[model samples]
Target: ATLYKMSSINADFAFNLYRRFTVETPDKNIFFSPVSISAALVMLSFGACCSTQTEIVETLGFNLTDTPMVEIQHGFQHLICSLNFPKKELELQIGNALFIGKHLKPLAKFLNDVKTLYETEVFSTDFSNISAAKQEINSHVEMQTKGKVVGLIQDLKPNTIMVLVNYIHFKAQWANPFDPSKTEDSSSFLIDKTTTVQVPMMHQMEQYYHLVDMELNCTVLQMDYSKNALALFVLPKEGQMESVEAAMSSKTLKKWNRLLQKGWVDLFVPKFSISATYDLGATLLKMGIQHAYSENADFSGLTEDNGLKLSNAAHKAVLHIGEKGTEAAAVPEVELTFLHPIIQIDRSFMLLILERSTRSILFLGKVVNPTE
Candidate 1:
């Protein structure tokens, strides 16, 4: 499959999952990688069979009868290769692993496919020793994500067959870093109509790409990463976040991408570092994927014994936006004669950190309280 075609499928799947998350947890911080979740599910599908396999594919927003299961697997493989392209400026890493109990005997073909296609590392642990197993899984993930995501697996079941993990780590300096000297401490951020909080807001006056959407009643701003990635901020009008979220979609995002125009503006964005951990098994079940978690599961493809089922699915992510960049070798040319437009994010707003080439959303969340 072509990378473009696969990415389109991934983009659609990602949005569907995003909408589900937003609907389920409307007011809390929402952050998860669609690519990472989708990749892990596809890897698990290789071991699924019968009705269990059917449910997984259907819930993932893929038409089972139209696209062959093997083709779907290949599509994910292609997408993985595209996202793994080497680049000097972006520090983007996607990690996947399968931890299996020593008692469960998985098919050789399934493990081989995992290694060849998904490039996943395999580990064997005794589920009986619950504490030891949990520590090993958490330490492996911490190492993979450079300690950005720790304690990813909190608890493991006694009869756990396999635990699947997918995580991402991203860090990049802004193209034009915010001057630390100009940042204001104790800036006011309106939490709601009657509440407010204080935070350290980073400020800069420079050329940025932004758009004012009258329909959504929000201002969208694009902040550049070093070269290959960008962070997008969606600031909705006070007390209108629910409306904006209901009206937002993938098509709307495309329109915003095209409508952004480059111009000078005085921008103020909060400096925040936040992390979110989710038990995806719950979310998947809510999305009509129940057979995999129940006793009626059919994973005959994995072992002839025919008792395998999905035990645990987990995800963790972290993001830090600050005033860090390469040393300023040359001064930026500033045009100070005319007044520039100002866009201050002194309130709650939604953020998306994504890669430019693949359009994969690495992290998505809203900042309600920076101090938390």
Candidate 2:
């Protein structure tokens, strides 16, 4: 599948996650259509990003298993598509297969629950946007992200508007889950070649799903999802991160994950977190969204007043790996940051998924942990 197609599915899922999490409010001019042309265009651009088979792997200290790539493109694609259509006071092209109406009470209750349950995590993470666009997007991102990213829409235009936001936070757990005093700072080789900074690596010896990948001389530490699904963290031997990354692919991921038999393995995992932010416009272009950046792109559904076009798209994400488990969160915002300073819509989060596996991300999601 292409990146734009993946993004289309992501947008659809994000819209539904919004609906599922929020209390429905009527009097909002929200309409979701599977037939909107611009919606199709956005999805088309999304598909192009992941079209290449190039794969990358990281090495820290753990082992990795060799496996064929799974054809999860469709599963990941359809999973998001199955979500309920977006509910809005304005016309937005979000859904492709489902049509959703307003459900005010549910959305309201959801917002209330979010404030109470995730206040701490949200406060620790910051999201900021331009002031002008806050109220326009129904303040959806502000309320959802609890103010981590702002100004989704900077300028209103008839071209493709790009949006972006990101946050980074780190927590250190005791080396031994049973003992908090064992924590100590150790050396960790960054998979990144551009930076030579030394990162503190927390060490822990525990039981985990360990596998000897046929392709690499490393162990794959498995972290099962809260649900039946699982996350596998791979750490290659010293100076092998780049080598492993080059050989990675969708086909290999599927094969390795499925071959697991769940064996007793000695584990030495790192306790650290990393932050990354990227502009998705060029990535979208790489993914096949040719029309999104052009004047020919159409977004009339955003407002009948004039056809809306995305001006910018940016994504910010972070990962926290600890002894108890793992937590990762990110915010993907698409806006007209410069010209109009209006944010159309944004996807933000406070997630606590159970693993530090970044391999599944090529086919899975990077920012928002969908299952959480």
Candidate 3:
């Protein structure tokens, strides 16, 4: 499969997950790395067969028959390779880590395939001691993300058998840096007509790719980094936040990207740092990724221990955007928009950081409040 097709599929899955988050937590600061979560699932699916694999693939917003597993895996290999390429102005650390019970013996092919394709590392974990095992996993992610992503796994299921994690640490300098000296310290961010809070607003005046999405009642803006990365920010018109959220999809993203035109934009973005923790079990259940946590689960390819039930799917992500640029880090345990010139994101808005070459959504989030 071409990188374009793979990226569009990933974008579809990302938007699907985002809509679920909106339904699950309507008024929270939603943030996460969609690529990390999907990559973790794709790696986990290597061990899946029959209904389990079909269910897993379909849950990711695609059909195994339409896009064969091998082809999809090949796309991910290309997808990840494009992001893993070294860039002088961009830093991206993305990989998978698998922790299995000491007694569990996984199939050799599954182990080798995940390692080779996803750049995953394996470790024997003692799930019987949840505290220590959790500590070990958390420490591993912290170190892997260079301390940007910590406490990745806080809690686990008592009968947990294996924990699969994917982490992404991205740091970059914006092409047009927001000067710290010009940032507004007393910007009033409106949560609603009656609610408001003070926040630090970073300002930048530069030529950028943007569009006034009249059909969606939002403005879409693109802020590029020095190299193969950029951020797409969306500010929906007043009282249109939920409407825009409901309309978020791969098609919408593509339309916005295609329509964006270069112009001199005056941008006012909130200098907010946000973090989110998710229990992917419930969400995945809603998305039809069932039977894995049940007796009928067929993950035998990844392990020889029969009747192994999935206990939990834990994931967490953090994003810090300032005048200097962005330091976004995220991890998964199972785990949009644009606007035009003179745009100000002082209220609830969505943001997607993408890799330019493959169009992978490294981080997708919303900033409802900067202080949170």
**lDDT minimum window of 10 residues, candidate 1:** 327-336
Please give each candidate's TM-score.
0.91, 0.46, 0.93
Descending-lDDT candidate ranking: 3, 1, 2
Tell me, by lDDT, which candidate is best.
Answer: 3
> lDDT by residue for model 1 over 1-372, one digit each (tens)?
444444556656666766677777766677777778878888877778777887787777777666778888887787677676667866677768888777778778877888788877778778888999989989999998878789888867688877889998665768888877777999998877667888888899999999999989999999988867788899998787887767666677788888999999999988777777777887798877787788877777776665567789888877777776322222244411589999999888888776777677766777766666
Count of backbone collisions in candidate 2: 88
**Candidate 2's residue-wise lDDT over 1-372, tens digit each?**
432233333333333322322223211111121112222223322222221211110011001132112222333233233221232211111111110111111123323432232221111111133333324342443344344334333333322233322222122222124222343444433333343333344343344444567676444555553322244455554555435434444344456657655543433344454333333355345434445455554323222223223445433333345544333322122200123211100121111222121111211112121112
TM-score of 2: 0.46
The global Cα lDDT (0 to 1) of model 1 is: 0.77
lDDT agreement of model 2 with the native: 0.31
* Model 2 weakest lDDT span, ten residues long: 54-63
